[PDB]
Amino acid sequence: RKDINKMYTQDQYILRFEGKLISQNKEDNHRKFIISFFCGDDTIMVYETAD
Amino acid sequence: MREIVHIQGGQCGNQIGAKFWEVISDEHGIDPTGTYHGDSDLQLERINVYYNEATGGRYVPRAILMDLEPGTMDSVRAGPFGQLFRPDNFVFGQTGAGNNWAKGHYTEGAELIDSVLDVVRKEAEGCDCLQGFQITHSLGGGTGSGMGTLLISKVREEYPDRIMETFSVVPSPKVSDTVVEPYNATLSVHQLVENADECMVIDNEALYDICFRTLKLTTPTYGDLNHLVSAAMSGVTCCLRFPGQLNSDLRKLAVNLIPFPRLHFFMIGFAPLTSRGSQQYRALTVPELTQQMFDAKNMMCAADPRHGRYLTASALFRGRMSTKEVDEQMLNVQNKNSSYFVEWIPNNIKSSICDIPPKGLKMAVTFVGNSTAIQEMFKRVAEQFTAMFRRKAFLHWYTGEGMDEMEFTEAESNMNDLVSEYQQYQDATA
Amino acid sequence: MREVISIHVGQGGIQVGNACWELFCLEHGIQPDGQMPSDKTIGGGDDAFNTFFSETGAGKHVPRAVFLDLEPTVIDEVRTGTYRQLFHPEQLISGKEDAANNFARGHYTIGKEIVDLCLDRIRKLADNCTGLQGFLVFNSVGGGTGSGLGSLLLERLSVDYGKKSKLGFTIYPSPQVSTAVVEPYNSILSTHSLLEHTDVAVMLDNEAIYDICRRNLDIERPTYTNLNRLIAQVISSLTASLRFDGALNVDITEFQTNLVPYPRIHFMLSSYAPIISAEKAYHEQLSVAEITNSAFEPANMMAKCDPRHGKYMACSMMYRGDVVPKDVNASIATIKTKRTIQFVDWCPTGFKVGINYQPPTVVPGGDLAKVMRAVCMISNSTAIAEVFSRLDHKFDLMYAKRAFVHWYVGEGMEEGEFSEAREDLAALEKDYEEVGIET
Amino acid sequence: MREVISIHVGQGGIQVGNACWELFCLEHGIQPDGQMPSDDDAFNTFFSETGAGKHVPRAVFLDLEPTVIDEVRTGTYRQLFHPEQLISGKEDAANNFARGHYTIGKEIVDLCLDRIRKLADNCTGLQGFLVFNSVGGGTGSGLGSLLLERLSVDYGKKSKLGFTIYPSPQVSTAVVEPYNSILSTHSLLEHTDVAVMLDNEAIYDICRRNLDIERPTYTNLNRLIAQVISSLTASLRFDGALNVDITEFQTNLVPYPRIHFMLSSYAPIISAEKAYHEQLSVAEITNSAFEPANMMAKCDPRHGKYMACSMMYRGDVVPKDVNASIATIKTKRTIQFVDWCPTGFKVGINYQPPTVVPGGDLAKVMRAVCMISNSTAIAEVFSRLDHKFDLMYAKRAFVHWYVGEGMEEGEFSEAREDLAALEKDYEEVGIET
Amino acid sequence: NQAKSHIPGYAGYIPGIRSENMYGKTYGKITYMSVTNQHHKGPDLPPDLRYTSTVKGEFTDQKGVKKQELLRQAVIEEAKITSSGYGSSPLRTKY
Numbered sequence A: 001r002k003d004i005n006k007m008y009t010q011d012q013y014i015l016r017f018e019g020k021l022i023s024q025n026k027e028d029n030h031r032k033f034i035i036s037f038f039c040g041d042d043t044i045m046v047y048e049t050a051d
Numbered sequence B: 001m002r003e004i005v006h007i008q009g010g011q012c013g014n015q016i017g018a019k020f021w022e023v024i025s026d027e028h029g030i031d032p033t034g035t036y037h038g039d040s041d042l043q044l045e046r047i048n049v050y051y052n053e054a055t056g057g058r059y060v061p062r063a064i065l066m067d068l069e070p071g072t073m074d075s076v077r078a079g080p081f082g083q084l085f086r087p088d089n090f091v092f093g094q095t096g097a098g099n100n101w102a103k104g105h106y107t108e109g110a111e112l113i114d115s116v117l118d119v120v121r122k123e124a125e126g127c128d129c130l131q132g133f134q135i136t137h138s139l140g141g142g143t144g145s146g147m148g149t150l151l152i153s154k155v156r157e158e159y160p161d162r163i164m165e166t167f168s169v170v171p172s173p174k175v176s177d178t179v180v181e182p183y184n185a186t187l188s189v190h191q192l193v194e195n196a197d198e199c200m201v202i203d204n205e206a207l208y209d210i211c212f213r214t215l216k217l218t219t220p221t222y223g224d225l226n227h228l229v230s231a232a233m234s235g236v237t238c239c240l241r242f243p244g245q246l247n248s249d250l251r252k253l254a255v256n257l258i259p260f261p262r263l264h265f266f267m268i269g270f271a272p273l274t275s276r277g278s279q280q281y282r283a284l285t286v287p288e289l290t291q292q293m294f295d296a297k298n299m300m301c302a303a304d305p306r307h308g309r310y311l312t313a314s315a316l317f318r319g320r321m322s323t324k325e326v327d328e329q330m331l332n333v334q335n336k337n338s339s340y341f342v343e344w345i346p347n348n349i350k351s352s353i354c355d356i357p358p359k360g361l362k363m364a365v366t367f368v369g370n371s372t373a374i375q376e377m378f379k380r381v382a383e384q385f386t387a388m389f390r391r392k393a394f395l396h397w398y399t400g401e402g403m404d405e406m407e408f409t410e411a412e413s414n415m416n417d418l419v420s421e422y423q424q425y426q427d428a429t430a
Numbered sequence C: 001m002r003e004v005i006s007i008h009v010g011q012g013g014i015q016v017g018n019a020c021w022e023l024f025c026l027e028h029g030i031q032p033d034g035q036m037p038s039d040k041t042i043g044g045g046d047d048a049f050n051t052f053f054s055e056t057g058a059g060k061h062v063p064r065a066v067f068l069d070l071e072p073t074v075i076d077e078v079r080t081g082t083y084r085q086l087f088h089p090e091q092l093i094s095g096k097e098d099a100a101n102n103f104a105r106g107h108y109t110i111g112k113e114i115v116d117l118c119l120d121r122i123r124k125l126a127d128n129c130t131g132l133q134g135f136l137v138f139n140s141v142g143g144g145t146g147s148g149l150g151s152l153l154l155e156r157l158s159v160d161y162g163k164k165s166k167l168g169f170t171i172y173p174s175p176q177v178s179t180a181v182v183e184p185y186n187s188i189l190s191t192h193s194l195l196e197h198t199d200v201a202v203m204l205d206n207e208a209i210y211d212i213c214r215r216n217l218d219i220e221r222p223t224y225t226n227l228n229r230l231i232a233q234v235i236s237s238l239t240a241s242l243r244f245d246g247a248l249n250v251d252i253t254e255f256q257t258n259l260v261p262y263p264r265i266h267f268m269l270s271s272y273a274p275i276i277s278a279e280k281a282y283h284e285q286l287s288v289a290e291i292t293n294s295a296f297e298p299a300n301m302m303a304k305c306d307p308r309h310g311k312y313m314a315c316s317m318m319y320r321g322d323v324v325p326k327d328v329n330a331s332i333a334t335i336k337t338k339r340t341i342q343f344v345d346w347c348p349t350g351f352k353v354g355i356n357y358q359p360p361t362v363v364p365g366g367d368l369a370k371v372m373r374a375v376c377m378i379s380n381s382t383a384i385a386e387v388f389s390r391l392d393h394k395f396d397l398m399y400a401k402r403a404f405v406h407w408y409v410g411e412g413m414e415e416g417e418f419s420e421a422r423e424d425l426a427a428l429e430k431d432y433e434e435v436g437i438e439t
Numbered sequence D: 001m002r003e004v005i006s007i008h009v010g011q012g013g014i015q016v017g018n019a020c021w022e023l024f025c026l027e028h029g030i031q032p033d034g035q036m037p038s039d040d041d042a043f044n045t046f047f048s049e050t051g052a053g054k055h056v057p058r059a060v061f062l063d064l065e066p067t068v069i070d071e072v073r074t075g076t077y078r079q080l081f082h083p084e085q086l087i088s089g090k091e092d093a094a095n096n097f098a099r100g101h102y103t104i105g106k107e108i109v110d111l112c113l114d115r116i117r118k119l120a121d122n123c124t125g126l127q128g129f130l131v132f133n134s135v136g137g138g139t140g141s142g143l144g145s146l147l148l149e150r151l152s153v154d155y156g157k158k159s160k161l162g163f164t165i166y167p168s169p170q171v172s173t174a175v176v177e178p179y180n181s182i183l184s185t186h187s188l189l190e191h192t193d194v195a196v197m198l199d200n201e202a203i204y205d206i207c208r209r210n211l212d213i214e215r216p217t218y219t220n221l222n223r224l225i226a227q228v229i230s231s232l233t234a235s236l237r238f239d240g241a242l243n244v245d246i247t248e249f250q251t252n253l254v255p256y257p258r259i260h261f262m263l264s265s266y267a268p269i270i271s272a273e274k275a276y277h278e279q280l281s282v283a284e285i286t287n288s289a290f291e292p293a294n295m296m297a298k299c300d301p302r303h304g305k306y307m308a309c310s311m312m313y314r315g316d317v318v319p320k321d322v323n324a325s326i327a328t329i330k331t332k333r334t335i336q337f338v339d340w341c342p343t344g345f346k347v348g349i350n351y352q353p354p355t356v357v358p359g360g361d362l363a364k365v366m367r368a369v370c371m372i373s374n375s376t377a378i379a380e381v382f383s384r385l386d387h388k389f390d391l392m393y394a395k396r397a398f399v400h401w402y403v404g405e406g407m408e409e410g411e412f413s414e415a416r417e418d419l420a421a422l423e424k425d426y427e428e429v430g431i432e433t
Numbered sequence E: 001n002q003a004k005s006h007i008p009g010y011a012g013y014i015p016g017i018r019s020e021n022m023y024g025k026t027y028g029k030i031t032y033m034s035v036t037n038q039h040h041k042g043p044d045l046p047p048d049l050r051y052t053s054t055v056k057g058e059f060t061d062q063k064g065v066k067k068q069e070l071l072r073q074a075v076i077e078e079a080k081i082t083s084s085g086y087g088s089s090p091l092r093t094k095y
């Protein structure tokens, strides 16, 4: 079963957030990342920003 | 943009204009002082089609008024919406013609043409882009019909590439108005047919027929006749002023109603037309539109449309209505009278839509069809013309101002040339 | 780095362009003014709208369109309408005089003083891009104005932009429902215009649209505005693969390489499903097996042609939604087993299938209801001969008495042009028959 | 994964199909609105999943006139049936056997047959077709015969079932049933495998003798028949130690290719007013099941011979009692079995208890038995029509309005001949070797 | 209270279904329009309604319509939700 009742109504809403990466390697300390959260079927999306 | 100008001739041409701007004035929201008091923004976007711009924000119709006597000309100005016309535009003579066509074609009409043509040229030139001329006169008046056409021919010789709309009234046999009608009415047809592009005919006899049969009022006056005719004219240019699904300019209607350059005759009619009794008894539904459109009694032209066979026609709906029924409902008519449609011209109905309808109703339609049945009007008039010539009756007038009998003979053959040539296609088979 | 511009000619072309841009609009959530919502203050990511939009650095996004037309009223409405702040102000060149169904007027006299700006407008938008993939052409044949400027546009573009492929979804005269009275001329002459100078063209007879609407949408009184929206969804699906990432893309260049076997035979018609009204949609599970099966339902083909009368040679199908490949494989096989629909002898494989994840976006107040699965088709079949052959009868009958030929002669067009036109169309009818005979 | 398609044709069949759904609907807990009560593939038999929430009952209704169909479209069951599967036309046949098969019938079947086809494709386990129709109307045979005639060439070996309703021996509605029935019998004899007589008249006697209600209306009759389907099908989708499938039916009630008509009886039917006063013993329940009066059709089994009977026990019946239940029956002399068929029973054990409709007549019980059995006594039903049918043709009255609809005059000749052909054969089976 | 519009395939008549046009909707939406009076009625025109013409006033806007549908949907089943109880519904004598 793939849920249906949720994704006929609760898809229009979409959430956007901003954050900074964390890890051991100093190579990845100061760039920027954007996390996207869809409320339909619990999906997470990630993109890389380049100034 | 894509605008035309207006020219009128004679009392009938003069009087007809009196309401055409009266009918146009209400729909365009022009108060009699020329100030704007409209309620919708689009009521001004395309206002240039029939109004120019001047000081004070007031608008003036771009019409040319011309007559051979002062009684009719001075009369119009005092009527409702009669002050719109500009004073400089008027030009008039001081002789008087009196139904003597020969008087109105060579001596009196030609002599004063200099100004009338001059007043024509100035108006058209100033525009951004001319589209054509619409002409309304009457063939029953020697000064009108004669001097009416003489202006017509010259216009063509100056501008070949523009369309030219023609309106007028021809005398029916049963209802007669002038014993000298046949001579001037038929002659003008000679010059017009050689130059006129679009049709011009409407029959008074059917005009009154609609007056009592549908409207069922007791005693109509000249107010009624002006009202019905003008509204039909508003139908011709209805889509040219407001947005619509498929606009239909004169040329597009021109492009879809002339099988050949010479057969340029149409009969016009207006619907729906009901009297006070059926204003709310009837239901304005698409079945009513077509049902009253093709029937004879609504057809304002004397020619019976059921004694011939259509070659082609088009319609111009007004108001907002779903197109589908426009497509098939016209389809049904094109078959259920299977014989009533000539065989070699497939798909012979043209359609269009307008969104802003004329005031007084939410929906209306105008009919424009070139029906071979028109031949009756010529034949009935044609028969009269020959009869009055053999006995040399009333040949003294026209021969007293430089016109010879040779011309009369030529016109006699040409018209009979038309009628003989017009009937051939009616029975044409593939 | 993929770009595709729009060329629009004709009232039917303009409005179809009107709807399609909107359908592009609601799909991505961009408001008319150019600011995405009145709130979205992050952005700078999810580069997907480059396919049909170009960035200004900050603010609005200019559609890759250039509006042309020979009438002032219809174009003027677009500028004064509710989208006055979206289209580029100076890219909507408009003329002064109408053509009025006079193809001769639209192809030798008036179109010449508008095409000159047309190249300038095209060259302006094309250069900014870097990966121009294809051109979309929506041209109404049933109006000369659509033909001439529309026809010439295909010609001129044929000699400057070189080998770049071009696409077009045409609208030819209806079988029995009629719009004009001079359509047979503008229809027959036009076919020559695009036959030797267009890569691909599609059949979209309006009548089928009317019937298609009634059988599923439940509308007994549909109008044009309903018709346009259904078309865009046809556009939306085909191009959707270029901007939504998926498990298998289908590049705009990668249709005609698979949907045109020889230079001459280059006409395909499409079909759409499912299309279900709000009162009945949710009631059905819209399974994959059923959806594709309706795809070949002869009654529901988008244009009134009878593919049952013949075979199939080329067709590529694009899926968009949440279907799974298992669903694709089973559906095709059931088609191969069927007997009502058959295949030509020389095309052992005839299913070019694409898959997309993003669901087609539903419009507010539209005819369609919310849906998840979606699959569109572009099929070639020998049945297309009906449209031309039936019209082939139409062109001659009028020409037999040369009625209405008097105008077209005077606009500068030679008398001999009508002589050649009938010959070429004959070959296509002749050309279609030859491929239809098995080896 | 096993599915069955229901085809209901005919106004009288309409409501009964309407009636048969309320009983079926309330057994699986699906509320009339369509949303499931909340909380197992056992519902797959008569229902299909739409993806989320509601369900689409595998329904196809047909009737050339909209009034009857509209009411179901306007009552309290609006959201259950598919929105567009209630095919409806414009004009009524007016009881004529011809207009429903030579004037107007074909203009709807094109929209009709396509509806039947799809229902299978979405499924996987088509077990058989049940058809409900009314003979006593011109429409009933026309569309019904056409589908059954048409349906014999689109799917083939797959079986089909039909519950017809012929006129009562002395209670009738019109004067045209004797004709329209005889012709219809011609159609079904070569397109349906099995059918069970359900003549209405006996139902009124059935209703009055037990329920103790003196003003029955047509709705009350429908519920009885509506429940009758359940027992015939109930075994399909419930847990059981010994089940009977849809296909496992023709192998037990078809002594030969031609004779395939059997008359059923149902019990116990005891009103709640007096359903607590007796032990409802399985031994006693079965005995009342065979009493001649309670026979569900107005064709007395006593007058005829017996060949084979397949009956189902539903409830908590202990198998041994059934074995002890069947044994005593062999002894009696009221029903005397058959020479060439020493055994004519196929015992079925089903578990779930029959459900109860609120505000109706039936009471709640934990034991019952329904039967679908044949006998040579069925030779009476056609004879009584046979005697009547010949009577009218002596003057051809009302025939002119059947030929004038395109039906050939010779057609009536062939139909009455076949009935005689079927009539003679029944005498053949009844004669001992 | 009826059911505030009917299903697609319902025979019969719906108040202003052939008198005030009502062209443009699929059918389910049209059906609800009739019962709850919202349309001009009578061969007359309020100046505002003239001048919705198609392109100028329909097939445009954007999110204003979205709030319209949501409001419209809520008032169809909500009146229909006026039924409950584990007794099914009046099938016995309503017919």
Ligand SMILES: Nc1nc2c(ncn2[C@@H]2O[C@H](COP(=O)(O)OP(=O)(O)OP(=O)(O)O)[C@@H](O)[C@H]2O)c(=O)[nH]1
Residues within 6 Å of the ligand: B245, B246, C009, C010, C011, C012, C013, C015, C070, C071, C100, C101, C140, C141, C142, C143, C144, C145, C146, C171, C179, C180, C206, C209, C224, C225, C227, C228
């Ligand atoms: N199906 C459909 N066809 C349309 C629509 N609008 C225009 N057309 C087609 O367009 C043809 C005529 O041309 P239009 O689009 O109306 O206007 P145009 O492109 O400027 O061509 P002209 O009318 O000659 O000026 C008609 O025959 C129609 O088939 C529409 O909304 N739906």
Ligand SMILES: Nc1nc2c(ncn2[C@@H]2O[C@H](COP(=O)(O)OP(=O)(O)OP(=O)(O)O)[C@@H](O)[C@H]2O)c(=O)[nH]1
Residues within 6 Å of the ligand: D010, D011, D012, D013, D015, D016, D063, D064, D065, D092, D093, D094, D095, D096, D134, D135, D136, D137, D138, D139, D140, D165, D167, D172, D173, D174, D200, D218, D219, D221, D222
């Ligand atoms: N069991 C039962 N039989 C019915 C019912 N209504 C009608 N009948 C029977 O059906 C016969 C007439 O045929 P109907 O089914 O009612 O009508 P029809 O099949 O729609 O035929 P047309 O009315 O011409 O369309 C009558 O003689 C009754 O015996 C019912 O509600 N229940």
Ligand SMILES: Nc1nc2c(ncn2[C@@H]2O[C@H](COP(=O)(O)OP(=O)(O)O)[C@@H](O)[C@H]2O)c(=O)[nH]1
Residues within 6 Å of the ligand: B009, B010, B011, B012, B015, B097, B098, B099, B138, B140, B141, B142, B143, B144, B145, B146, B169, B171, B177, B178, B204, B207, B222, B225, B226
């Ligand atoms: N129906 C109608 N016809 C008119 C009207 N005024 C003039 N006519 C027609 O015009 C003809 C007389 O025109 P007349 O003034 O003598 O022509 P002129 O001498 O050239 O100006 C009559 O036969 C009428 O048919 C009018 O108000 N209504």
Ligand SMILES: Nc1nc2c(ncn2[C@@H]2O[C@H](COP(=O)(O)OP(=O)(O)O)[C@@H](O)[C@H]2O)c(=O)[nH]1
Residues within 6 Å of the ligand: D242
């Ligand atoms: N003792 C006993 N016999 C059984 C049981 N179930 C079935 N039978 C016998 O098996 C026979 C039916 O076999 P059946 O299931 O139809 O075989 P199938 O048709 O191949 O499935 C009956 O005559 C019973 O006597 C059981 O649980 N116990």
Ligand SMILES: [Mg+2]
Residues within 6 Å of the ligand: B247, C011, C070, C071, C098, C100, C145
């Ligand atoms: Mg145009």
Ligand SMILES: [Mg+2]
Residues within 6 Å of the ligand: D010, D011, D065, D137, D139
């Ligand atoms: Mg009935």
